[PDB]
């Protein structure tokens, strides 16, 4: 029969090559037979009719099958979504052929899993002979697989099956940079050369694969062909640890079909969820948050940002939290900021905050929450494990009543984890600001904390009690290694604030910035003069100092002449002061004395080419400094006048920090 083969080679193709022909009668309805040659490739069998010449009767490919039952056995019967073939062939030593072959593909492609497992339903009802075959296919040796676990050879293999045309640029991808950079995430934003639709046998080739653990993408708006892959890969996959979709505008259908694959899936490997961005909406967020309460694994982190919850979905979902024994000692990290905490009971909110819990960090922010509720639940929960603790943007209470209950100071004084808090955007009051302060110099188990309290209306609650505010006064402060106090609107009342900051042993990094709105000259002087003895007593322990989007204009000039003579500070951010070339002038002479400033942040001065070229000239003979951010803003302008001499100058001061 060769006459017969080549007419069947001219159809699907030379090279393409084919390892099995055969004979076989499909068996078809109506109780009528047909005569069929059958072929088989590496990922795919086809059935052409007998005659010459052949046309194409029907093609399925391996990853189609659901599943293969034999029973009578000359007589083989293969199931697909497509349709189910039923095979007369001469011999039984023929279907164990073709059967031992397509498990020995799917072994080849698909290392790590059983060729059961792929084509789901394998029954011959002379069981023994499926004994045979396992150990067949135990029996051949296996090439140690690609890179990734194969995965250029299982994308080749579904490009094939699904229809798509196999990318090099795919395979060179991951056979050599994903290789190099022992990566174990497919990032969604690593094949944007390709076209959207290219990215569908990219991520279906992840079901049967066991290198990569961890799928993302952000800031990509994700197909609907693509959200069927993602999901088919979460309903199938046993090694996919972690799922970070991120403001990929899925909505709440997807939220809910999301719940659907993670439902059917008997054992998930997810621990790690970030969905922020998309507007899941509670309906989505209540759908999934079922599956989460039952998960095997646990949450380790969640972060669902800015998905359009109110109170309603992050109650749903906190008490399906809570539900879940594991979350507890396993979630560590915690994201709710920018959905809506207020006006919308939360019982199941502090509930689960409360019951001790290993969360590391929490974020709220741009929630509106309240302090005086949620530092209340973390009190009881939280003392352990929490380090990181935003809080930004939100009202202290949602009472019209004034008290400070005790949940708040006492957590301050109780926490042994916190390291970073944000209570920053929030107007705090003279006494909750008391209560915190009080709190954390109370508290000794904390070291190093770094506190922002940037735009929280300080001003107006120093003008309104204070004096002691900070003065509480009996301890103070040994704890804070970072403060922020910019944007607080203390204008003159920064003096009060400057002289309890040089009664201070701990603080590292201070920023002032943008308390300086409008105030008279003969008001402000006195303030800069305060902050000059600070940076200049010997004993400063202030390493970095932010002066911010002050406004000053030519007044930094002051501190920037102390500068020079500066032997503490290792950073400074003068930007966004408006101080021109005159202030460029001195900042330079500045650093041709100073030997001790790692890092200087001077943006939006106004600065001009004839500046810029002031400071390219004292950083040749200044060996110290090792970064000096370019300033993006100021350069583009300088641009638009001299667009020759501000290139070379800034090129000169990059060089020499190159070198330094």
């Known amino acids: 029969p060769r006459e017969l083969m080549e007419s069947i080679k001219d159809v699907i193709g030379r090279k393409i090559k084919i390892s099995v022909k055969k004979k076989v009668k499909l068996e078809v309805k109506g109780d009528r037979v047909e005569n069929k040659v059958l072929v088989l490739t590496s990922c795919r069998a086809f059935l052409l009719s007998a005659r010459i010449p ?201 939220a809910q079909k999301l719940a659907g694959a993670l439902a059917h899936n008997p054992n998930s490997g997810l621990h790690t969820i970030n969905l922020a961005g998309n507007s899941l909406e509670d309906r989505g967020v209540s759908s999934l948050s079922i599956q989460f309460a039952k998960l095997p694994k646990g949450l380790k982190h969640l972060n669902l940002s800015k998905t359009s919850l109110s109170p309603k979905g992050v109650n749903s979902l906190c008490q399906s939290l809570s539900a879940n024994p594991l979350t507890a000692s396993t979630l560590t990290h915690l994201d709710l900021s920018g959905n809506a905490l207020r006006g919308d009971d939360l019982s199941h909110m502090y509930n689960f905050l409360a019951q001790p819990n290993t969360i590391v960090h929490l974020d709220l922010s741009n929630t509106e929450c309240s302090l005086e509720m949620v530092c209340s639940a973390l009190l009881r929960g939280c003392l352990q494990c929490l380090a990181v603790l935003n809080l930004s943007r939100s009202v202290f209470s949602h009472r019209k009543g004034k008290e400070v209950p005790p949940s708040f100071k006492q957590f301050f004084s109780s926490s042994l984890a916190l390291i970073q808090i944000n209570l920053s955007g929030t107007k705090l009051s003279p006494e909750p600001l008391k209560a915190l302060l009080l709190g954390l110099a109370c508290n000794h188990s904390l070291k190093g904390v770094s506190l922002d309290l940037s735009n929280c209306e300080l001003g107006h609650c120093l003008r309104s009690g204070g004096a002691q505010v900070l003065e509480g006064c009996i301890a103070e402060i040994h704890n804070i290694t970072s403060l922020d106090i910019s944007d607080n609107g203390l204008e003159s009342d920064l003096s009060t604030l400057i002289v309890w900051l040089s009664k201070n042993r701990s603080i590292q990094h201070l920023a002032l910035g943008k308390n300086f709105n409008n105030m008279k000259s003969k008001n402000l002087t006195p303030v800069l003069d305060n902050l000059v003895q600070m940076i200049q007593d010997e004993d400063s322990p202030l390493q970095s100092l932010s002066l911010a989007d002050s406004k000053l204009k030519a007044e930094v000039t002051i501190i920037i002449n102390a500068l020079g003579s500066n032997t503490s500070l290792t950073k400074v951010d003068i930007s966004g002061n408006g101080m021109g070339d005159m202030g460029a002038k001195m900042l330079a002479k500045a650093l041709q004395i100073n030997t001790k400033l790692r890092t200087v942040i001077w943006d939006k001065n106004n600065i001009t080419a004839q500046g810029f070229q002031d400071i390219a000239v004292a950083m040749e003979k200044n060996y110290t400094l090792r970064f000096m951010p370019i300033p993006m803003y100021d350069a583009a302008q300088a641009l638009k006048t001299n667009p020759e001499k501000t290139e070379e100058a800034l090129q000169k001061i990059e060089n020499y920090l190159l070198r330094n």
């Not at 056979?175 to 174990?184: A, C, E, V």
């Not at 990569?212 to 994700?222: A, E, H, I, N």
Request: charged share 25%; with cysteine.
């Open 54 to 254: 052949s046309k194409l009767e029907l093609t399925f490919s391996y990853l189609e099958i659901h599943g293969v039952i034999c029973h009578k056995p000359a007589q083989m019967v293969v199931e697909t979504e497509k349709c189910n073939m039923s095979m007369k062939m001469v011999s039984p030593e023929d279907v164990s052929e073709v059967l031992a072959h397509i498990g020995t593909c799917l072994r080849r492609i698909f290392p790590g899993l059983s060729p059961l497992r792929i084509m789901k339903k394998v029954s011959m009802e002379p069981s023994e002979r499926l004994a045979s075959l396992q150990a067949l296919w135990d029996s051949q040796t296996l090439a140690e697989p690609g890179p990734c676990g194969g995965f250029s050879q299982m994308y080749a293999c579904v490009c094939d099956w699904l229809g798509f045309s196999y990318k090099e640029e795919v395979q060179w991808d991951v056979d050599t940079i994903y290789l190099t950079q022992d990566t174990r995430e497919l990032n969604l934003q690593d094949f944007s050369h390709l076209e959207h639709r290219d990215l569908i046998p990219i991520i279906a080739a992840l079901e049967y694969n066991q290198w990569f653990t961890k799928l993302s993408s952000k800031d990509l708006k994700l197909s609907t062909d693509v959200c069927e892959q993602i999901l088919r890969v979460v309903s199938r996959s046993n090694r996919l640890e972690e799922l970070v979709l991120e403001n990929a505008g899925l909505r709440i259908d997807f």
